[PDB]
Amino acid sequence: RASPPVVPVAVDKYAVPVANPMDPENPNAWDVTLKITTKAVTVPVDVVMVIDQSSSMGGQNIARLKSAIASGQRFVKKMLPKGMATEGVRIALVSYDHEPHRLSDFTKDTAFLCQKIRALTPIWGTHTQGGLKMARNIMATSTAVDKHIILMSDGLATEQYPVKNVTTADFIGETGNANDPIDLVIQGAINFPTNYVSNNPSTPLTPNYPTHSSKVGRRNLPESKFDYSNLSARITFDGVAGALVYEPRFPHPYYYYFPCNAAINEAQFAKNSGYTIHTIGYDLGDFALANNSLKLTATDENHFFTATPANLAAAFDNIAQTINIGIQRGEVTDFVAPGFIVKNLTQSGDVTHLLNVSNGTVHYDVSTKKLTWTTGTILSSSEATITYRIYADLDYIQNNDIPVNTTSAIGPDLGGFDTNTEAKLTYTNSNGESNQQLIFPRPTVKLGYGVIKRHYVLVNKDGQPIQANGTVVSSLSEAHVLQSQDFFLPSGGGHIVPKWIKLDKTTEALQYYSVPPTNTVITTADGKRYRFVEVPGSTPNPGQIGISWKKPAGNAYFAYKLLNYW
Ligand SMILES: [Ca+2]
Ligand SMILES: [Mg+2]
């Protein structure tokens, strides 16, 4: 009925630099993981144990109470396995004879509960309704999701509360089902009248005894029909009670209170409040009235069992539920940031098998650089992850003044470029509430390696950049290319052949290198020869070229003009 607590969810994201070994295609590489973690929920559950300590559980039958005492302690310890540190579970304790006794309010104190169970002692009278009423009183203060009453009895109730403004309509005759407690108690009292029907053998007063036409107390009276003002109140005839209590104010064919039915009636009020009722029958001789009364008192017949060693050992193994699902539905949107590309993602569509994906499926849109991860259901106490490799696009970073992230603190490089513009989980939580949202952390990175490209271009006589046909252009980057571009690698350690110049990540100041052309004379395929010149805008021999983690792609433009041999 009440909703359990929601399973906690948390998200994390981080970029791990690719190292030992570095990525061979591009050392500016990071493995980015997005991670969803679910925790756990124990559903709160309150239990009231109700134990029959009536005289029928003692004397000749003392193995009954002894078994209730042994099994009740076992149940307490099974449901409170960590004692006062047990999450979610509390147990209260009621005993009863001719009146109920509140032995413990709700507690996790297993030693206290077991001590009270060990002190049970047989006392005349079996006021099962009263035990159940006290359990209902105790359970009324519970705010648990699950609420259980466990009744441990030999099943023959012999006392009950008075019925207000009692009339003949508060009683009922044989149902025609020989196994109904009504029919059983009537037949039983016909066969064994002095075992069933309230009578003090010491006094001359005697009840009228029942026949097949007699009427016994109903089990479906409204709660307003019982007088609960005194929780030790009884119905008696001739100063005593019994499995049937004669009501002398009503005539032939004779009317009898039926405590087993009153207890079923009282349990119905508990069921109407949403409580689960378990009954355990300690009369192992198969007395149908007792067992069948306890079956009807329980939530259903499967919540009754006889107190055999095997049934007792197996009972109440997991009274506390744990929530199985942490996320019912989830969608992670992850926009990769400018300057970074995802390894091997060339077209839109399903990229699940191009990434490492623990759960669900991943879609990629090339134009927006957006990963959409459909998680599916994620269980509690679990983690779901996707991991993909990104590379830095050096020429894009060179050509664009990308902002740095000065707010995130997770690294790996504080103050670096974002790997993600935004990543968000939208999900349906463990109770089915949709549109829950969590924002992932923002990794930041600085490039570790740059490049220096050397270009070999044509100028005219007057030092102007030109196309091959002589038309002047605005910049050397537009001029005719005479020789394939190549890369420059300085001396010193830390650089990676063929082109990767190790960068100083601790500064934004350009690191300058002395870059020479590979050659100062170029002879083309057509036999024309070109000689190196230093002109406005062009790189001298050698020339200072600077790179940094923010501007990692330097470009030298070496100018050449035609050598004319006539
Ligand atoms: Ca008598
Ligand atoms: Mg008894």
Author numbering: 99 to 418, 419B, 420 to 664
Could you pull the original sentences from the published paper?
P. gingivalis expresses two antigenically distinct but structurally homologous type-V fimbriae that are important both for attachment to other bacteria and for invasion of different host tissues. Instead, Mfa5 is the only fimbrial protein that has been found to be dependent on the type-IX secretion system for translocation across the outer membrane. Surprisingly, despite being unrelated in sequence, Mfa5 shows a striking similarity to the Gram-positive adhesins RrgA and GBS104, which both have a vWF domain and a number of IgG-like domains that appear to function as the stalk to project the VWF domain toward ligands, presumably those presented on host cells. Thus the vWF domain is a clear indication that the D1 domain of Mfa5 functions as an adhesin, but the ligand has yet not been determined.
In this study, we present the crystal structure of the N-terminal half of Mfa5, residues 99–664, at 1.8 Å resolution. The structure consists of three domains (D1 to D3) that build up an elongated shape with dimensions of 46 Å × 48 Å × 164 Å. The first domain, D1 (amino acids 142–418), forms a Rossman fold classified as a vWF domain. The vWF domain comprises a cleft harboring a MIDAS motif with a bound Mg2+ ion. The second domain, D2 (amino acids 105–135 and 423–544), has an IgG-like fold composed of a β-sandwich with three and five β-strands, respectively. Intriguingly, the vWF domain is inserted between strands B (first sheet) and C (second sheet) of the D2 domain. Interestingly, an intramolecular isopeptide bond connects Lys111 of the first β-sheet to Asn518 of the second β-sheet. Instead, the isopeptide bond is stabilized by Thr517 (OG) and by Tyr486 (OH) via a water molecule. D3, encompassing amino acids 547–664, comprises six β-strands in a twisted tube-like β-sheet that can be classified as a ubiquitin-like roll. The D3 domain folds like an incomplete IgG-like domain, and comparison to the IgG-like domains in RrgA and GBS104 lead us to speculate that strands are missing from this domain.
